[PDB]
């Protein structure tokens, strides 16, 4: 709908929003993975003992 010079602004807004969403998702996943790793270590210790 827009020529490149005008489109760039909307494209940048979308890029910023989606990058923020991806960063939030990845951070949440990292924290959840740390929790699951703690649980897995506990389970491994439970097995071994």
């Amino acid at each position: 709908r827009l020529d490149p010079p005008e489109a760039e602004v909307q494209i940048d807004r979308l890029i910023t929003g989606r990058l923020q969403s991806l960063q939030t998702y990845v951070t949440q996943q990292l924290i959840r993975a740390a929790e699951i790793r703690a649980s897995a270590n506990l389970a491994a210790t439970k097995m071994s003992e």
Binding site: R1, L2, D3, E6
Partner: protein, 49 residues
């Protein structure tokens, strides 16, 4: 103060000729670029004169 409003639908619009007609002193589009109008589709177009 009594600007006249006209409705246009059920037709094919060739904006190329209108844009190429240099008789228009000001030809300014905001939501869409003038060039791309020939490729878009609209539910209906209002013309206020």
């Amino acid at each position: 103060y009594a600007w006249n409003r006209k409705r246009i639908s059920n037709c094919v619009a060739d904006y190329s000729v209108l844009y190429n007609s240099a008789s228009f002193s000001t030809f300014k589009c905001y939501g869409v670029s003038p060039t791309k109008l020939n490729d878009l589709c609209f539910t209906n177009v209002y013309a206020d004169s």
